[PDB]
Protein backbone atom coordinates (compact mmCIF):
# COMPACT_ATOMS: atom_id res chain seq x y z
CA UNK A 1 0.00 0.00 0.00
CA UNK A 2 1.64 3.50 -0.69
CA UNK A 3 2.42 6.25 1.90
CA UNK A 4 1.93 9.46 2.22
CA UNK A 5 5.39 10.95 3.52
CA UNK A 6 9.59 9.70 3.59
CA UNK A 7 10.89 7.93 6.26
CA UNK A 8 14.60 7.27 6.63
CA UNK A 9 13.41 2.94 7.00
CA UNK A 10 12.62 3.14 3.26
CA UNK A 11 15.84 3.15 2.38
CA UNK A 12 16.61 -0.50 3.72
CA UNK A 13 17.56 -3.17 1.36
CA UNK A 14 14.45 -5.28 0.38
CA UNK A 15 12.37 -2.20 1.07
CA UNK A 16 9.74 -0.98 -1.65
CA UNK A 17 7.58 1.69 -1.26
CA UNK A 18 4.89 3.69 -3.01
CA UNK A 19 5.10 7.23 -2.25
CA UNK A 20 2.16 9.72 -2.94
CA UNK A 21 2.61 12.68 -4.89
CA UNK A 22 0.79 15.92 -4.80
CA UNK A 23 2.74 18.78 -6.36
CA UNK A 24 1.57 22.72 -6.00
CA UNK A 25 6.65 19.67 -2.97
CA UNK A 26 8.19 16.77 -4.29
CA UNK A 27 10.73 18.03 -6.67
CA UNK A 28 11.95 20.82 -4.31
CA UNK A 29 11.34 19.59 -0.51
CA UNK A 30 10.84 15.63 -0.52
CA UNK A 31 12.96 14.36 -3.34
CA UNK A 32 16.12 16.52 -1.69
CA UNK A 33 15.54 15.33 1.93
CA UNK A 34 15.39 11.02 -0.05
CA UNK A 35 19.11 12.46 -1.21
CA UNK A 36 20.31 13.95 1.82
CA UNK A 37 19.47 10.94 3.57
CA UNK A 38 21.08 8.33 1.09
CA UNK A 39 24.04 10.46 0.99
CA UNK A 40 24.48 10.93 4.54
CA UNK A 41 24.18 7.31 4.70
CA UNK A 42 26.69 6.20 1.76
CA UNK A 43 24.13 4.46 -0.41
CA UNK A 44 24.63 4.07 -4.03
CA UNK A 45 21.57 6.05 -5.61
CA UNK A 46 19.89 6.51 -8.73
CA UNK A 47 17.07 8.76 -9.28
CA UNK A 48 15.30 8.19 -12.07
CA UNK A 49 13.07 10.72 -13.91
CA UNK A 50 10.00 10.33 -16.70
CA UNK A 51 11.37 12.60 -18.90
CA UNK A 52 14.19 15.05 -19.66
CA UNK A 53 12.40 18.05 -18.54
CA UNK A 54 11.73 16.42 -15.36
CA UNK A 55 15.01 15.33 -14.70
CA UNK A 56 16.59 19.22 -15.62
CA UNK A 57 13.51 20.30 -12.86
CA UNK A 58 15.34 17.72 -10.37
CA UNK A 59 18.70 18.66 -11.48
CA UNK A 60 18.05 22.43 -10.54
CA UNK A 61 16.39 21.65 -7.24
CA UNK A 62 19.45 19.20 -6.27
CA UNK A 63 22.37 21.71 -6.93
CA UNK A 64 24.29 21.44 -4.22
CA UNK A 65 23.86 18.25 -3.78
CA UNK A 66 26.27 15.93 -5.92
CA UNK A 67 24.26 14.79 -8.38
CA UNK A 68 25.14 13.66 -11.88
CA UNK A 69 22.86 14.64 -14.74
CA UNK A 70 23.50 11.60 -17.15
CA UNK A 71 21.42 13.00 -20.35
CA UNK A 72 22.20 10.10 -22.69
CA UNK A 73 23.03 6.13 -22.38
CA UNK A 74 28.43 6.52 -3.14
CA UNK A 75 29.81 9.95 -2.78
CA UNK A 76 27.67 10.94 -6.29
CA UNK A 77 23.98 10.73 -6.90
CA UNK A 78 23.05 9.59 -10.47
CA UNK A 79 20.09 11.25 -12.46
CA UNK A 80 18.68 10.02 -15.87
CA UNK A 81 15.71 9.40 -17.45
CA UNK A 82 13.90 6.00 -17.28
CA UNK A 83 14.74 4.88 -20.68
CA UNK A 84 17.96 6.27 -20.30
CA UNK A 85 18.15 3.77 -17.16
CA UNK A 86 16.40 0.78 -19.59
CA UNK A 87 18.88 1.71 -22.15
CA UNK A 88 21.92 1.51 -19.75
CA UNK A 89 20.77 -1.94 -18.72
CA UNK A 90 21.01 -3.26 -22.61
CA UNK A 91 24.35 -2.26 -22.70
CA UNK A 92 27.10 -4.96 -22.66
CA UNK A 93 29.00 -2.90 -19.67
CA UNK A 94 27.36 -3.82 -16.57
CA UNK A 95 25.67 -1.02 -15.25
CA UNK A 96 26.42 0.05 -11.35
CA UNK A 97 25.16 -1.91 -8.81
CA UNK A 98 22.89 0.70 -7.17
CA UNK A 99 21.37 -0.25 -3.56
CA UNK A 100 18.65 2.34 -3.84
CA UNK A 101 16.57 3.38 -6.62
CA UNK A 102 14.06 6.22 -6.96
CA UNK A 103 11.34 6.38 -9.74
CA UNK A 104 9.71 9.38 -10.22
CA UNK A 105 6.05 9.46 -11.73
CA UNK A 106 6.37 5.51 -11.34
CA UNK A 107 3.47 4.96 -13.23
CA UNK A 108 4.47 5.77 -16.45
CA UNK A 109 3.58 2.89 -18.68
CA UNK A 110 5.61 3.01 -21.49
CA UNK A 111 7.78 -0.39 -21.80
CA UNK A 112 11.20 1.17 -21.00
CA UNK A 113 9.12 2.32 -17.45
CA UNK A 114 7.67 -1.07 -17.10
CA UNK A 115 10.72 -2.97 -17.94
CA UNK A 116 12.53 -0.70 -15.29
CA UNK A 117 10.07 -1.16 -12.47
CA UNK A 118 10.99 -4.80 -12.69
CA UNK A 119 14.13 -4.82 -12.93
CA UNK A 120 14.53 -2.61 -9.76
CA UNK A 121 11.67 -4.26 -7.98
CA UNK A 122 13.63 -8.13 -8.63
CA UNK A 123 16.55 -6.15 -6.74
CA UNK A 124 14.57 -5.66 -4.60
CA UNK A 125 13.10 -8.71 -3.60
CA UNK A 126 16.69 -10.46 -3.77
CA UNK A 127 17.77 -8.35 -1.21
CA UNK A 128 20.33 -5.82 -2.79
CA UNK A 129 18.59 -2.61 -3.16
CA UNK A 130 15.76 -0.33 -1.64
CA UNK A 131 13.39 1.44 -4.04
CA UNK A 132 10.62 4.16 -3.91
CA UNK A 133 8.26 4.31 -6.43
CA UNK A 134 7.05 8.04 -6.56
CA UNK A 135 3.12 8.17 -8.05
CA UNK A 136 -0.51 9.59 -7.40
CA UNK A 137 -1.59 6.41 -9.23
CA UNK A 138 0.45 2.86 -8.93
CA UNK A 139 -0.93 0.28 -10.64
CA UNK A 140 -4.34 -1.13 -10.00
CA UNK A 141 -5.53 2.71 -8.94
CA UNK A 142 -9.36 2.52 -9.43
CA UNK A 143 -10.00 5.93 -8.73
CA UNK A 144 -9.90 8.81 -11.56
CA UNK A 145 -11.48 11.76 -9.32
CA UNK A 146 -8.94 11.48 -6.35
CA UNK A 147 -8.80 13.73 -3.94
CA UNK A 148 -6.45 17.21 -4.48
CA UNK A 149 -5.12 20.52 -3.13
CA UNK A 150 -7.65 22.17 -4.07
CA UNK A 151 -11.19 20.37 -4.77
CA UNK A 152 -11.98 19.96 -8.76
CA UNK A 153 -15.53 20.67 -10.50
CA UNK A 154 -15.82 17.50 -12.23
CA UNK A 155 -18.39 17.94 -15.22
CA UNK A 156 -19.26 14.97 -17.39
CA UNK A 157 -19.59 16.68 -20.87
CA UNK A 158 -19.63 15.78 -24.95
CA UNK A 159 -16.25 16.31 -25.36
CA UNK A 160 -15.12 16.79 -29.71
CA UNK A 161 -13.51 14.03 -31.08
CA UNK A 162 -13.14 15.96 -34.41
CA UNK A 163 -12.77 19.43 -35.87
CA UNK A 164 -16.26 21.12 -35.62
CA UNK A 165 -18.16 23.69 -37.48
CA UNK A 166 -20.39 25.40 -34.99
CA UNK A 167 -21.55 24.25 -31.29
CA UNK A 168 -18.85 23.85 -28.63
CA UNK A 169 -18.87 27.14 -27.83
CA UNK A 170 -17.67 26.51 -23.88
CA UNK A 171 -14.40 25.38 -25.63
CA UNK A 172 -13.44 28.87 -26.89
CA UNK A 173 -15.73 31.17 -24.65
CA UNK A 174 -12.87 30.15 -21.58
CA UNK A 175 -10.33 32.83 -20.67
CA UNK A 176 -8.11 30.70 -18.67
CA UNK A 177 -5.71 27.92 -20.15
CA UNK A 178 -6.60 24.91 -20.86
CA UNK A 179 -4.77 21.21 -21.69
CA UNK A 180 -6.93 19.19 -23.72
CA UNK A 181 -5.87 15.30 -23.94
CA UNK A 182 -5.96 13.34 -27.07
CA UNK A 183 -5.72 10.19 -28.13
CA UNK A 184 -3.02 10.17 -30.71
CA UNK A 185 -0.78 12.96 -32.31
CA UNK A 186 -3.39 12.67 -35.68
CA UNK A 187 -6.51 13.51 -33.51
CA UNK A 188 -4.55 16.35 -31.38
CA UNK A 189 -3.53 18.17 -35.06
CA UNK A 190 -6.99 18.00 -35.91
CA UNK A 191 -8.30 19.76 -32.63
CA UNK A 192 -5.09 22.07 -32.56
CA UNK A 193 -6.27 23.17 -36.50
CA UNK A 194 -10.21 23.64 -35.26
CA UNK A 195 -8.85 25.92 -32.11
CA UNK A 196 -6.26 28.15 -33.90
CA UNK A 197 -9.01 28.61 -36.80
CA UNK A 198 -10.98 30.29 -33.78
CA UNK A 199 -8.06 32.27 -32.77
CA UNK A 200 -6.94 30.52 -29.74
CA UNK A 201 -2.94 29.92 -29.49
CA UNK A 202 -2.17 26.23 -29.40
CA UNK A 203 0.90 24.58 -28.36
CA UNK A 204 0.90 20.32 -29.12
CA UNK A 205 2.55 17.66 -27.25
CA UNK A 206 3.52 14.46 -27.86
CA UNK A 207 6.93 11.48 -27.12
CA UNK A 208 8.78 12.65 -30.49
CA UNK A 209 8.46 16.15 -29.86
CA UNK A 210 7.66 17.16 -26.19
CA UNK A 211 11.49 17.31 -24.92
CA UNK A 212 11.79 20.66 -27.09
CA UNK A 213 8.14 21.74 -26.99
CA UNK A 214 6.94 21.98 -23.29
CA UNK A 215 9.52 24.70 -22.71
CA UNK A 216 7.44 26.73 -25.48
CA UNK A 217 4.97 26.82 -22.47
CA UNK A 218 7.05 28.84 -20.37
CA UNK A 219 8.02 31.28 -22.87
CA UNK A 220 5.13 32.60 -25.65
CA UNK A 221 1.70 33.06 -25.26
CA UNK A 222 -0.96 30.14 -25.52
CA UNK A 223 -4.74 29.49 -24.59
CA UNK A 224 -4.50 25.33 -24.92
CA UNK A 225 -1.99 22.64 -24.80
CA UNK A 226 -3.34 20.07 -26.89
CA UNK A 227 -1.50 16.70 -25.82
CA UNK A 228 -1.19 12.80 -25.95
CA UNK A 229 -1.03 10.82 -22.80
CA UNK A 230 2.92 12.04 -22.19
CA UNK A 231 1.77 14.97 -20.15
CA UNK A 232 0.65 12.33 -17.44
CA UNK A 233 4.06 11.96 -16.32
CA UNK A 234 5.05 14.98 -14.30
CA UNK A 235 4.36 17.60 -16.89
CA UNK A 236 3.62 21.29 -15.09
CA UNK A 237 1.23 23.61 -16.49
CA UNK A 238 -0.33 26.87 -15.44
CA UNK A 239 -3.89 26.06 -16.60
CA UNK A 240 -7.35 25.79 -14.96
CA UNK A 241 -8.87 23.86 -17.03
CA UNK A 242 -8.32 20.14 -18.04
CA UNK A 243 -11.02 18.47 -21.11
CA UNK A 244 -10.32 15.00 -21.15
CA UNK A 245 -11.32 12.91 -24.58
CA UNK A 246 -10.97 9.88 -21.60
CA UNK A 247 -9.42 7.99 -24.78
CA UNK A 248 -6.14 6.44 -25.92
CA UNK A 249 -4.78 4.22 -28.68
CA UNK A 250 -3.76 0.75 -27.61
CA UNK A 251 -1.04 -0.79 -29.41
CA UNK A 252 -1.88 -4.61 -29.56
CA UNK A 253 -0.29 -7.67 -30.94
CA UNK A 254 -2.43 -9.46 -33.03
CA UNK A 255 -1.91 -13.04 -33.18
CA UNK A 256 1.79 -12.56 -32.96
CA UNK A 257 2.01 -11.12 -35.80
CA UNK A 258 1.27 -7.71 -36.62
CA UNK A 259 0.86 -4.78 -34.59
CA UNK A 260 -2.00 -2.35 -34.76
CA UNK A 261 -3.62 0.60 -32.82
CA UNK A 262 -6.80 -0.04 -31.10
CA UNK A 263 -9.19 2.55 -30.51
CA UNK A 264 -9.90 5.66 -29.57
CA UNK A 265 -10.85 3.73 -26.30
CA UNK A 266 -11.59 4.22 -22.55
CA UNK A 267 -8.13 5.10 -20.61
CA UNK A 268 -7.37 3.72 -17.19
CA UNK A 269 -8.49 5.14 -14.03
CA UNK A 270 -5.25 5.68 -13.21
CA UNK A 271 -4.58 8.09 -16.98
CA UNK A 272 -7.80 9.77 -16.18
CA UNK A 273 -6.56 10.33 -12.45
CA UNK A 274 -3.37 11.53 -13.77
CA UNK A 275 -4.90 13.82 -16.44
CA UNK A 276 -7.18 15.74 -13.97
CA UNK A 277 -4.12 16.06 -11.62
CA UNK A 278 -2.79 18.65 -14.26
CA UNK A 279 -5.18 20.77 -11.81
CA UNK A 280 -6.57 21.59 -8.58
CA UNK A 281 -2.44 21.69 -7.51
CA UNK A 282 -3.00 25.34 -5.86
CA UNK A 283 -4.97 25.23 -2.40
CA UNK A 284 -5.40 28.94 -2.63
CA UNK A 285 -6.66 28.89 -5.98
CA UNK A 286 -9.81 26.97 -6.21
CA UNK A 287 -12.11 27.03 -9.09
CA UNK A 288 -10.09 24.59 -11.60
CA UNK A 289 -12.44 22.51 -13.89
CA UNK A 290 -12.15 19.33 -15.41
CA UNK A 291 -14.40 17.72 -18.33
CA UNK A 292 -14.68 14.75 -19.32
CA UNK A 293 -16.09 13.21 -22.32
CA UNK A 294 -16.95 9.13 -21.02
CA UNK A 295 -15.74 6.78 -18.91
CA UNK A 296 -12.65 4.92 -17.88
CA UNK A 297 -11.91 1.00 -18.47
CA UNK A 298 -9.13 -0.97 -16.98
CA UNK A 299 -5.95 -2.25 -18.99
CA UNK A 300 -6.60 -5.71 -21.16
CA UNK A 301 -4.45 -8.15 -20.83
CA UNK A 302 -3.26 -7.47 -24.71
CA UNK A 303 -1.66 -3.93 -24.33
CA UNK A 304 1.36 -4.34 -26.39
CA UNK A 305 3.76 -2.42 -23.77
CA UNK A 306 3.68 -5.25 -20.91
CA UNK A 307 4.80 -7.42 -23.66
CA UNK A 308 7.25 -5.48 -25.44
CA UNK A 309 8.59 -4.84 -21.65
CA UNK A 310 8.84 -8.58 -21.33
CA UNK A 311 11.05 -8.50 -24.49
CA UNK A 312 13.39 -5.98 -22.95
CA UNK A 313 13.77 -7.99 -19.43
CA UNK A 314 14.49 -11.16 -21.65
CA UNK A 315 17.62 -9.02 -22.56
CA UNK A 316 18.96 -7.80 -19.83
CA UNK A 317 21.98 -9.19 -17.40
CA UNK A 318 20.62 -9.31 -13.57
CA UNK A 319 22.96 -12.23 -12.24
CA UNK A 320 24.50 -15.23 -13.93
CA UNK A 321 21.32 -16.69 -15.83
CA UNK A 322 18.08 -15.00 -14.25
CA UNK A 323 15.93 -13.04 -16.06
CA UNK A 324 13.87 -9.92 -13.73
CA UNK A 325 10.27 -9.92 -13.02
CA UNK A 326 8.01 -7.36 -13.81
CA UNK A 327 6.73 -5.83 -10.64
CA UNK A 328 3.75 -7.71 -9.21
CA UNK A 329 0.88 -5.56 -9.40
CA UNK A 330 1.97 -5.40 -13.36
CA UNK A 331 2.41 -9.12 -14.02
CA UNK A 332 -0.64 -10.41 -14.78
CA UNK A 333 -0.95 -7.96 -17.67
CA UNK A 334 1.31 -11.04 -20.03
CA UNK A 335 1.19 -14.15 -20.60
CA UNK A 336 4.66 -14.18 -22.04
CA UNK A 337 7.28 -17.25 -20.92
CA UNK A 338 10.05 -15.54 -18.70
CA UNK A 339 12.69 -16.06 -21.25
CA UNK A 340 10.84 -16.57 -24.53
CA UNK A 341 12.45 -13.20 -26.20
CA UNK A 342 16.23 -13.92 -25.35
CA UNK A 343 18.19 -13.43 -28.16
CA UNK A 344 22.25 -14.63 -28.72
CA UNK A 345 24.76 -12.21 -28.42
CA UNK A 346 24.57 -10.71 -32.23
CA UNK A 347 20.83 -10.75 -32.56
CA UNK A 348 20.79 -9.11 -28.89
CA UNK A 349 22.90 -6.35 -30.42
CA UNK A 350 21.13 -5.77 -33.68
CA UNK A 351 17.68 -5.31 -31.31
CA UNK A 352 19.32 -2.42 -29.44
CA UNK A 353 20.24 -1.15 -32.43
CA UNK A 354 17.09 -0.98 -34.03
CA UNK A 355 15.13 0.80 -31.19
CA UNK A 356 18.29 2.85 -30.20
CA UNK A 357 19.71 4.18 -33.73
CA UNK A 358 16.36 2.71 -36.08
CA UNK A 359 14.05 4.28 -33.64
CA UNK A 360 11.70 1.33 -33.89
CA UNK A 361 9.09 -0.09 -31.45
CA UNK A 362 10.11 -3.03 -28.94
CA UNK A 363 8.20 -5.32 -30.72
CA UNK A 364 8.96 -4.43 -34.74
CA UNK A 365 13.24 -4.25 -33.74
CA UNK A 366 12.56 -8.06 -32.15
CA UNK A 367 11.44 -9.28 -35.26
CA UNK A 368 13.82 -8.03 -37.75
CA UNK A 369 16.89 -9.17 -34.72
CA UNK A 370 15.03 -12.37 -34.21
CA UNK A 371 15.21 -13.21 -38.26
CA UNK A 372 18.94 -13.03 -38.03
CA UNK A 373 19.07 -9.51 -40.04
CA UNK A 374 21.27 -7.01 -39.44
CA UNK A 375 20.71 -3.34 -38.44
CA UNK A 376 22.05 -1.95 -41.94
CA UNK A 377 20.07 -4.27 -44.24
CA UNK A 378 16.38 -2.79 -44.93
CA UNK A 379 15.41 -5.25 -47.67
CA UNK A 380 12.26 -6.25 -45.21
CA UNK A 381 11.52 -2.93 -45.34
CA UNK A 382 9.84 -3.57 -48.69
CA UNK A 383 9.15 -7.95 -49.07
CA UNK A 384 6.05 -7.95 -47.09
CA UNK A 385 2.81 -9.04 -48.33
CA UNK A 386 0.88 -6.20 -49.99
CA UNK A 387 -1.75 -6.22 -46.99
CA UNK A 388 1.57 -4.45 -45.44
CA UNK A 389 2.02 -1.58 -48.08
CA UNK A 390 2.12 1.35 -46.21
CA UNK A 391 0.31 4.65 -47.14
CA UNK A 392 0.94 8.42 -47.45
CA UNK A 393 -1.28 10.87 -49.25
CA UNK A 394 -4.01 8.09 -50.33
CA UNK A 395 -1.50 6.25 -52.39
CA UNK A 396 1.59 3.63 -51.40
CA UNK A 397 4.13 5.09 -50.09
CA UNK A 398 7.96 5.06 -51.73
CA UNK A 399 11.02 5.37 -51.05
CA UNK A 400 14.51 6.07 -52.58
CA UNK A 401 16.86 3.42 -50.95
CA UNK A 402 20.54 3.81 -50.56
CA UNK A 403 21.02 1.60 -53.43
CA UNK A 404 19.27 3.39 -55.80
CA UNK A 405 15.94 2.14 -56.32
CA UNK A 406 12.24 3.35 -56.00
CA UNK A 407 10.55 1.03 -53.70
CA UNK A 408 7.06 0.97 -52.25
CA UNK A 409 6.93 0.75 -48.55
CA UNK A 410 5.88 -2.67 -47.55
CA UNK A 411 7.49 -4.05 -44.57
CA UNK A 412 7.62 -7.88 -43.80
CA UNK A 413 5.84 -7.03 -40.64
CA UNK A 414 3.58 -4.45 -39.56
CA UNK A 415 4.06 -2.24 -36.82
CA UNK A 416 1.19 0.22 -36.76
CA UNK A 417 3.15 2.82 -34.87
CA UNK A 418 5.84 3.29 -37.74
CA UNK A 419 3.52 5.07 -39.60
CA UNK A 420 0.47 6.84 -37.24
CA UNK A 421 1.56 10.17 -37.76
CA UNK A 422 3.65 12.23 -40.30
CA UNK A 423 7.05 12.76 -38.05
CA UNK A 424 7.07 8.52 -37.81
CA UNK A 425 6.19 7.85 -41.33
CA UNK A 426 9.09 10.46 -42.15
CA UNK A 427 11.13 8.56 -39.91
CA UNK A 428 10.62 5.81 -40.94
CA UNK A 429 10.93 6.31 -44.81
CA UNK A 430 14.18 7.41 -44.16
CA UNK A 431 15.30 4.66 -41.96
CA UNK A 432 14.12 2.35 -44.65
CA UNK A 433 16.12 4.43 -47.03
CA UNK A 434 19.24 3.17 -45.00
CA UNK A 435 19.13 7.33 -43.97
CA UNK A 436 18.72 8.81 -40.39
CA UNK A 437 18.20 12.21 -39.63
CA UNK A 438 20.36 13.90 -37.52
CA UNK A 439 18.56 14.00 -33.85
Same mark, same amino acid.
Given at each position: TPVECFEPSMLKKKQLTVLDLHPGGKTRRVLPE?????????????????????????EEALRGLPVRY??? !?????? $??????????? =???????????????????????????????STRVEMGEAAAIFMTATPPGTRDAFPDSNSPIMDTEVEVPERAWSSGFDWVTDHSGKTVWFVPSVRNGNEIAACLTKAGKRVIQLSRKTFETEFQKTKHQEWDFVVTTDISEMGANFKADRVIDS??? =????????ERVI????????? !????????????????????? $??????????????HWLEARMLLDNIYLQDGLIASLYRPEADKVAAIEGEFKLRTEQRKTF???????? =????????? !?SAGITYTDRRWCFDGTTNNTIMEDSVPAEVWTRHGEKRVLKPRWMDARVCSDHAALKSFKEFAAGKRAAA
Open positions: IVREAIKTRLRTVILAPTRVVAAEMMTT !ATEIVD $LMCHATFTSRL =LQPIRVPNYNLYIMDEAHFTDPSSIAARGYIRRC =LKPVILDGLAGPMPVTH !ASAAQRRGRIGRNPNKPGDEY $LYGGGCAETDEDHAVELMKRGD =LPVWLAYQV !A
